[PDB]
Design a protein around this ligand. Structure first.
Ligand SMILES: O=c1ccn([C@H]2C[C@H](O)[C@@H](COP(=O)(O)NP(=O)(O)OP(=O)(O)O)O2)c(=O)[nH]1
Ligand SMILES: O=c1ccn([C@H]2C[C@H](O)[C@@H](COP(=O)(O)NP(=O)(O)OP(=O)(O)O)O2)c(=O)[nH]1
Ligand SMILES: O=c1ccn([C@H]2C[C@H](O)[C@@H](COP(=O)(O)NP(=O)(O)OP(=O)(O)O)O2)c(=O)[nH]1
Ligand SMILES: [Mg+2]
Ligand SMILES: [Mg+2]
Ligand SMILES: [Mg+2]
Lengths: 146, 146, 146
């Protein structure tokens, strides 16, 4: 597998520092999966309605022209009401700090216990358009929907 | 319209199975819209704060190198506080099951009634970078923000 | 800076109307940032659990083949529990109205005060696949995960 297949020639490298090397490197659960799963570095208990800012133990260098996106996992979302307050979290190209996940318990009654080493979110990487705004007085000067 | 116009030459086909053929195929509400609207196959009532995992009656084959993304509709979000616990839901290229939507009622007091055949979310399809992680000891070895 | 550098040759213009010209044009907080920050045109107070549909004072013309995406800011999300009900908000290419943000207070006890001129969300622009659905009876006729 050190040979990059023709179909993966243009695939993107993401530099990562394991700030907590006791956690595995994030990985795709299955071939073709959009995201790599991020771990919790911490034990945390969330009562109903409470949030926390949870360390993942990693820092990344998203390439210029791209964005990292932190999305909730669907299983925990349905089973226990686990969500992310700022979802999708937006990780900028220039960020060199630790990725942190703003977990929240949206269940009305049952606490959520997160253990160190649990997979608590997924990180996608996508291209983004670094847009140049052009201010106009009206869209004329410059649709079905309107 | 069987002729693919020059400007749509590179547009992507998405194979879909209507597991519930009583529902219309998902469609864009207007030309240029980012997403196709997903239907509920089910009647569901959500008391304030409650969630459900709602069947959409479809399965798709997102192409390798892409991702499907399940987003809430803005009208229901404002009018009645309808949201999605794991938003944006992440549909992987390898998934061949039914798309399910984790609806939640974020209103404090009024129940939300969803009927079979209502449009309850929107599905976008985007390219994703299937990233190769490169572990480094520091970003040096390998920004304004820092 | 009127010269487009070789590396920004293909970067995208976004036409914008300041419907409220008392607010600054949205901008990236730092070079390489994925999104430009949207302002509130309004003063709004959100009690715990309450939502509002907040005017941003801008209208944009997202290019055909692209999507605008309204994401929460991470600082307010952690500090005070500020979220967006329909996050990520989906701004279609054909939309020429004012961008509105569906803010919600997910804190259990403390109200959130938003002032006119505060930065309350971020707007990304990305390509989207305008998909052509092909209905199949089974995926055969037309994976690790299954
Ligand atoms: O909104 C969604 C999100 C996911 N899904 C399906 C498709 C996706 O490929 C699959 C797995 O999604 P997640 O990775 O978000 N869930 P989780 O990590 O809990 O499960 P898995 O171990 O299967 O990855 O669940 C939906 O039907 N609706
Ligand atoms: O956060 C948002 C999301 C949408 N919008 C606008 C732009 C978008 O093109 C339009 C429709 O968004 P949705 O498709 O999410 N809403 P809905 O499906 O309820 O209405 P429609 O019938 O108009 O599609 O609403 C915002 O101003 N802010
Ligand atoms: O889920 C997240 C989101 C952001 N972040 C980090 C990386 C990102 O580049 C940085 C800033 O994100 P936001 O722009 O969403 N936050 P805010 O606008 O409050 O702060 P800033 O002034 O730094 O942009 O915070 C995370 O660690 N986790
Ligand atoms: Mg998963
Ligand atoms: Mg719509
Ligand atoms: Mg910011």
């Amino acid at each position: 597998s050190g040979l990059v297949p023709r179909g993966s020639h243009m695939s993107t490298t993401l530099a990562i520092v394991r700030l907590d090397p006791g956690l595995p490197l994030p990985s795709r659960a299955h071939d073709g999966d959009a995201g790599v799963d991020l771990y919790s570095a911490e034990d945390v208990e969330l009562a109903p309605g409470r949030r926390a800012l949870v360390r993942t133990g990693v820092a990344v260098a998203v390439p210029f022209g791209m964005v990292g996106l932190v999305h909730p996992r669907s299983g925990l979302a349905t089973r226990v009401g686990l969500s992310i307050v700022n979802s999708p979290g937006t990780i900028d190209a220039g960020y060199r700090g630790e990725i942190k996940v703003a977990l929240i318990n949206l269940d009305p009654a049952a606490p959520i216990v997160v253990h160190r080493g649990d997979r608590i979110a997924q990180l996608l990487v996508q291209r983004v358009e670094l847009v140049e705004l052009v201010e106009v007085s009206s869209f004329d000067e410059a649709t079905s929907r309107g």
